[PDB]
Amino acid sequence: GFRSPCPPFC
Numbered sequence: 001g002f003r004s005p006c007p008p009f010c
């Protein structure tokens with residue numbers, strides 16, 4: 001379950 005803005009670039 002990756003998505004913007006997090007995770008994983010938060």
